[PDB]
Ligand binder design. Structure first.
Ligand SMILES: [Zn+2]
Ligand SMILES: [Zn+2]
Length: 63
């Protein structure tokens, strides 16, 4: 990554794919500790030992 601290601060960035473009949204899994994804991540579908592909995501407006 690479950016300056003279403008944008804590912009819309994913947790995994850490996207930059402003297209997706904040999608927080249903039942989980810390699982947030964006439109893309969702479209493709992500998961792991912790998060299960059978976990739905909710749309929130925080980031
Ligand atoms: Zn993402
Ligand atoms: Zn989950």
């Amino acid at each position: 990554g690479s950016s300056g601290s003279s403008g944008v601060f804590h912009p819309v960035e994913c947790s995994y794919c850490h996207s930059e473009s402003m297209m997706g949204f904040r999608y927080r899994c249903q039942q989980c500790h810390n699982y947030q994804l964006c439109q893309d991540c969702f479209w493709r579908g992500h998961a792991g030992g912790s998060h299960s592909n059978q976990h739905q995501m909710k749309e929130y407006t925080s980031w």
